[PDB]
Design a protein around this ligand. Sequence first.
Ligand SMILES: Cc1cc2nc3c(=O)[nH]c(=O)nc-3n(C[C@H](O)[C@H](O)[C@H](O)COP(=O)(O)OP(=O)(O)OC[C@H]3O[C@@H](n4cnc5c(N)ncnc54)[C@H](O)[C@@H]3O)c2cc1C
Ligand SMILES: NC(=O)c1ccc[n+]([C@@H]2O[C@H](COP(=O)([O-])OP(=O)(O)OC[C@H]3O[C@@H](n4cnc5c(N)ncnc54)[C@H](O)[C@@H]3O)[C@@H](O)[C@H]2O)c1
Ligand SMILES: Cc1cc2nc3c(=O)[nH]c(=O)nc-3n(C[C@H](O)[C@H](O)[C@H](O)COP(=O)(O)O)c2cc1C
Ligand code: SF4
Ligand code: SF4
Ligand code: SF4
Ligand code: SF4
Ligand code: SF4
Ligand code: SF4
Ligand code: SF4
Ligand code: SF4
Ligand code: FES
Ligand SMILES: [Zn+2]
Ligand SMILES: [Zn+2]
Lengths: 947, 590, 64
Amino acid sequence: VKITVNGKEFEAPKDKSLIEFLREITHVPGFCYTEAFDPYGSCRLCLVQTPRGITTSCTLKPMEGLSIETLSDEIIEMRKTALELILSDHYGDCIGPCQNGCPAHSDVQGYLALIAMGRYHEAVKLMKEKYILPAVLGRVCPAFCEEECRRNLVEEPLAIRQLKRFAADYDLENGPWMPEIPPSTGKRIAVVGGGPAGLACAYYLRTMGHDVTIFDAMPHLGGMMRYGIPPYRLPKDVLDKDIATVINTGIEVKTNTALGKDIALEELREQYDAVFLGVGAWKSRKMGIEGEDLDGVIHGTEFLRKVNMGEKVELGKRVIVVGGGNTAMDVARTALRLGADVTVVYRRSKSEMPANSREVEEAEEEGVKFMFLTNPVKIIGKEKVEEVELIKMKLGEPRRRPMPIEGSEFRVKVDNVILAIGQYCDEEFLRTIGIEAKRGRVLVDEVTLQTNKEGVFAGGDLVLGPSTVIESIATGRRAAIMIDLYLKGKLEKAREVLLDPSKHIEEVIYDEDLYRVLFDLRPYNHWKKVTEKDYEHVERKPRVKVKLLDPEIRKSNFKEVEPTMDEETVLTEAQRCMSCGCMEVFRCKLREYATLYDAKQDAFVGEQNKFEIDETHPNVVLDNNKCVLCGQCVNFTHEIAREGIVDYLFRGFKTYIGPQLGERLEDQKGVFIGELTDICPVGAITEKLPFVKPGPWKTQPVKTVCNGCSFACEMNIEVYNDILVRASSRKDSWNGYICDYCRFERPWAQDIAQPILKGNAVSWEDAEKFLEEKECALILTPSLTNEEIMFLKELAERKGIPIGSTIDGEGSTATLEDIRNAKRVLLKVNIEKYPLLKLLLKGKEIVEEGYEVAIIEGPAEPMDVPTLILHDGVNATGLIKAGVTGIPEAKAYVVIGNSPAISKLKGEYLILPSGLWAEKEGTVTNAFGMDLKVKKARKAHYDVKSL
Amino acid sequence: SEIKAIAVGMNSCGIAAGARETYEAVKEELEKRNLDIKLKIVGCVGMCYREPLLDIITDNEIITYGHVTPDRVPRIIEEHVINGKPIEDWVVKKDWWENGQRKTWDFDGYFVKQKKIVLENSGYIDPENIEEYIAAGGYEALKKAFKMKPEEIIDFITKSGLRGRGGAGFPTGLKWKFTRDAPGDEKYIVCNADEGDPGAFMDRNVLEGDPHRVIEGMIIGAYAIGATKGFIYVRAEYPLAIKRLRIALKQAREKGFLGENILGSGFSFEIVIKEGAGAFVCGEETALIASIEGKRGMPRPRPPYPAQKGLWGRPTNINNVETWANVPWIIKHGWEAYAALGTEKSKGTKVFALSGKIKHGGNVEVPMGITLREILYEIGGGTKTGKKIKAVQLGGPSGGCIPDYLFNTPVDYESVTATGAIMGSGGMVVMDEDTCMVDVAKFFLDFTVKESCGKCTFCRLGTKRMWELLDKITKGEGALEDIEKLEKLAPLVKTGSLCGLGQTAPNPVLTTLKYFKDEYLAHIEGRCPAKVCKPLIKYVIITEKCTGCTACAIMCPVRGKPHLINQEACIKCGTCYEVCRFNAIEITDA
Amino acid sequence: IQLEYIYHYEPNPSSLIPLLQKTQETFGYLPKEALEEISRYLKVPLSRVYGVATFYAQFRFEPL
Ligand SMILES: Cc1cc2nc3c(=O)[nH]c(=O)nc-3n(C[C@H](O)[C@H](O)[C@H](O)COP(=O)(O)OP(=O)(O)OC[C@H]3O[C@@H](n4cnc5c(N)ncnc54)[C@H](O)[C@@H]3O)c2cc1C
Ligand SMILES: NC(=O)c1ccc[n+]([C@@H]2O[C@H](COP(=O)([O-])OP(=O)(O)OC[C@H]3O[C@@H](n4cnc5c(N)ncnc54)[C@H](O)[C@@H]3O)[C@@H](O)[C@H]2O)c1
Ligand SMILES: Cc1cc2nc3c(=O)[nH]c(=O)nc-3n(C[C@H](O)[C@H](O)[C@H](O)COP(=O)(O)O)c2cc1C
Ligand code: SF4
Ligand code: SF4
Ligand code: SF4
Ligand code: SF4
Ligand code: SF4
Ligand code: SF4
Ligand code: SF4
Ligand code: SF4
Ligand code: FES
Ligand SMILES: [Zn+2]
Ligand SMILES: [Zn+2]
């Protein structure tokens, strides 16, 4: 039959549900559908518009001439309302608050877990995805991620900045991590400004393909990282190494080539595809009082760049500094080291100080005098500054903008005045380049960050004024995203989608770039309204302290105040993480649908059920707070597994999915409890990963098979850069499911480390001596792929060595289709030993006579009826072509792999290791005689064929 | 002629009123004054507002007495069966025969516009005796249908316009035709007696008063369809109905109407009474099938209809008790007589449960296509205290409120469906000027929230959200944004639910918004016009009219002078304004 | 023993609701051991027994 969907003529099968075909052609959300069971209408998300009204596509079978509207306004409204209803009951955090607090929004939890595991290069690799210069940020960043960490609700926020500094230093010293550069996109980008924003824009446009050219006035890169932040906070060799990490990606650096003095912005646009203005705010804002022209009045930024560049600045004993930003702190602690008595003046109170708080505390330790709630009025002196009159300030209620008191006459005799009121870019330069700005801050659209001149983007201190390194890097990354979007002509649709994607859902689905931009910039994060009472059960762990240089010796040298933490305390500090983010954040479909449909958590608010988490099982967690009640786990365990692990309990708003009253998941005697982790779509049933910190990583599945028994079930191994995380089930696998033995005992993730010689873990030299000295026979365990078997057989043939195996027999004339179609079976093997037979033989006649098919245990002889013979080796059907036969009864043996039948051998035996199963590539033959591919998750450390 | 029988209505309504005591008193009086007069029990006649009912039966007239407590049984015995004088004060119903028909005179005019088709034998025959049902013309339709071909019976039912009395109004003949045409060999038929409406008891009344009518309808339907087993899905909360069904089944089995070779036609059919544990959702046919199979009653997507895949896969026909009870009348009097009643698109008669603030409440058998105001004012007698009726809600807790100015609407499927309500169970709850409509909507939404199975997201979640919004409005903590959210959400919950419970869930809110938005807007201002919402009102005592009750604050949990009321810590319960002397407690706002 | 009532019902899963009602009659509630014997005799999972029992509001599990 043929149907019309959204006005386009389509051909669809008549028996299958419409949701399959529709999901093939368009985006149809839905939780509670799978082909294994009958259609379920428990989520109501697959709605379509039909002539009879709105109805669910999973229950719709195609009918002739049916018109389907998948994305009408009413359908979007209904799906958005349904998602908001579901989110009103959802409980959990998609990401940790550490990622939300970071202006770059970096995966803090993941690289903390990687630091706990000891893989510092991988932690730095995860850091690089959101921001550049992790060592610089580990030294200077104000640590916005620790402001709202969930460990603030227990004892103390995690040392994210210090652990990041340790990992970045380890990566800098022990071989830097450099990303992979995609092939050239043919576009060149010009960046004006060598600061953090320019470096971030250049790095993230280089990692996309476009070649980047950086224009910087000063001879060095870093901008105010080099000529701003003083060297006792950020050593310049560390900065050289970090900027080298950025620049080795292929960014051509043009220094002493300034915009407005060497090239013009019109010519810059004419000669380049796109331009980013990260020129910073290098001009210092004059305070605006009488007598500012007196000798001895200098600007804070000019003073700092004079000190950093290695020039002589004439500084007296008594210095007053005006400002409250980081600039005032750096000029204060730099003038203190030069031999002055420095005071800092600020209009507002201590808590409103934009400066980094730890730097304020350190300056208090070093002896910097702070004046808060005061401001200068005029600078008194004949020609040089001798005294400045201030007025005490008090900011009343309206913002609370400061307004001075009527009169106090704060007159202080001082030798130098240093102005650090703020920063801006020159208004004359901004006007002469035709770039609009207000008060020196460039005017741009908030989303696109694009100026009034087409092709020109801006960010950093130029746009945000008094910003930080991380905020400038975030603006630069956003500008790289927008420059890539503008280069492929998608900037306007992207702007509209980022404003509201629920109006352009088809365009979001159609273009992968819009999907990526939506999920990178505007993702739906579910948030938990937590307080101190929700973390009363965790064990208090102290935060590690790094010893600073002594304040008295600190106030007289330009040496680094804070060192990198010890390697011994790194694991202890990284194991205090509570893993607040959802373990299924990268796979949860509720999050994806709420991102696509612009669902709000606050739309419908009210009672939600609070469930305790069922972690009592050895390897499976059941969190009913994240349950959307699709019933797929219940349908599996009661229809296919036929184990009855869990079921619906109670009805209405109080419904949940639990084992039974009075028992938890540990007491259940099922062998398919680990399949429910792949069954659940919204992270309610999850798997306990064996690592110390399982912090979710964007893993990649690899197609391989299991080696638990001769079934050799196809499965996906989830890998995160050579980490073997977990085993999952593929939809395109003939079995479709894997058993708990394979998942949790992990026969694919273990082997024997050393060759075995009568229970002795001898080295390979002794094993080679044993092999060469004696003419042992070659015995093969069935845990080797077909290529390994062929290689060993060919070696034995050309070297004239008898060849054998731990198992002998023949048969297996039954295919999977025969087991499916036959009605009567003969059961001799123990069912519990082979768990897939539970699913394959469900609802079939088990008889002793007249059987159509039989299951027998190796060694066995094939019968006239289609027979299944089950060995205990994955490639035990490797004898169907090689004819490797059994033990040839020789003197001493070399056997590749460990089997219980080794004890049956007569004489001393050398057990060669068969290698790690997950590291092998080849084809295997299972019981049903189908050739299944095995692929490597990681690189093979040692090879069996080369032994 | 001479008085042959004394009868008392012994349905659940009669027992609740005290018909057991009346029955025992009559038996004792017949023993004490030695009289050989038969004493049988009958069903509920229909006048539920005058129970218990005692019948004096002669060969030509039946004189029914209302409100017959045990104290007045001696007087009626002495005056009527000993001396021979009707007590015209207590005669609430007189029944005589004219040319083979039954003529009824009612004191209150209850029966003037009533046409009893389903309930014609209720209150006149013994439900526990198959001989009386046989003598009253029963089971003759069974023999006539056995002399007909099953296809002819299906066409017979189709031509009558007998739409589904279960609430949705599906053509029953089409349902039987589908079930018979369904590919298979072993078929089942189910009587749907899971009457989940707390205010409707019509189907239970049919199962109690006239169970053989339901049994005969089921046997006719089974012969038409080709069924071999029959299931009567009735709640175990209905014990009297189950007992009478069991005794009627055994009596029909011993008289050759159930079992092997029913009336020598080569037809075998047994009826099994399946008992449900009690849920409003398992009255839905798919949840009924799931509960009979031993699962939990979660409704499934219906396009695989129960006629095609019902009980254990095999085809199943599921009809209401009233639908089965109309079938013998159709086979007996022909489809011409059933097509002679009702409107064009809604034939026959409908059984309505009149409740609420109505005067002549009970189960009315009225023709379809009747003006609503006739049922409300002549049959129902208007309101109890003469107050003007503000609205009526039809369909039970899943129905809609039809306002007073639409009482000219004919009562039929299409008219009530288009007005905003639904037929539902068949209950009319009368709401007057004293009734706050927002509280009524909250009551029905609370019942829907309680009775949801919790399968689909829209019902389970949106019904709870709608109830939260209604409780926010009722406590006065609402705004126009909440009304906007309700006006958005209610159509979405109606459109996006899976079973009829959630699809009919937003009906009360929708109809109250469409007709009574005045109280919706007024509850935003912290004022309840009907003065029944507890947080939006208080209770004050006026000194100008109060007296020395000395129990005004004592009867209420909370000397010769107007007492005090702690409005700060009052419960706003209301056990002062009803138990009051003179008129001393006005309500007013808080 | 009190669990003799299970053997008068047909050992089919559809007898669950009648068996649950009879257990509620016999003990006033659904005992753990009675429910386990119902699960073994009907050969239905205990999780489904508890799901059916918790679906209906009349069924009680405490000894009351
Ligand atoms: C803890 C901390 C302490 C800080 N302390 C200070 C401090 O003491 N002083 C301070 O100033 N900032 C300080 N900052 C802020 C610092 O400037 C950050 O790096 C800033 O947020 C990022 O600047 P930017 O990327 O916009 O460009 P910047 O790093 O500010 O530099 C802009 C670049 O543009 C170049 N440029 C300027 N004009 C032109 C032109 N006409 N043509 C071409 N190129 C041009 C400059 O040479 C420079 O390389 C601090 C930040 C933090 C987090
Ligand atoms: N091809 C077929 O065989 C076929 C096709 C369509 C319908 N049908 C049958 O038609 C019938 C009606 O189907 P439908 O989808 O129109 O409706 P439905 O079975 O979903 O019933 C919905 C109705 O239930 C009523 N209702 C709500 N609460 C009630 C209560 N407490 N008591 C009584 N009634 C209540 C309401 O009036 C509502 O309109 C069903 O029996 C169905 O199987 C069969
Ligand atoms: C929530 C709900 C409750 C229902 N309750 C009953 C009921 O108690 N009795 C009944 O006959 N139909 C009830 N129905 C309607 C049934 O689903 C079905 O339509 C009915 O059995 C058809 O009977 P009919 O052919 O006489 O119309 C209910 C439907 C719903 C959605
Ligand atoms: S990832 Fe999914 S399940 Fe986890 S908190 Fe977010 S929405 Fe909920
Ligand atoms: S850049 Fe700063 S805020 Fe972001 S994770 Fe690192 S330390 Fe935290
Ligand atoms: S405990 Fe770990 S995951 Fe949670 S907020 Fe802190 S750093 Fe992030
Ligand atoms: S726990 Fe079961 S019912 Fe709940 S969301 Fe997961 S699969 Fe669906
Ligand atoms: S059934 Fe055998 S092959 Fe399949 S996953 Fe389990 S152990 Fe591995
Ligand atoms: S509408 Fe309510 S009762 Fe009907 S299937 Fe959905 S949740 Fe269950
Ligand atoms: S009930 Fe009325 S009359 Fe009696 S004490 Fe109370 S207010 Fe006074
Ligand atoms: S009946 Fe209730 S509202 Fe009235 S006085 Fe007593 S406590 Fe107060
Ligand atoms: S309702 Fe169709 S997928 Fe859930
Ligand atoms: Zn009655
Ligand atoms: Zn009110």
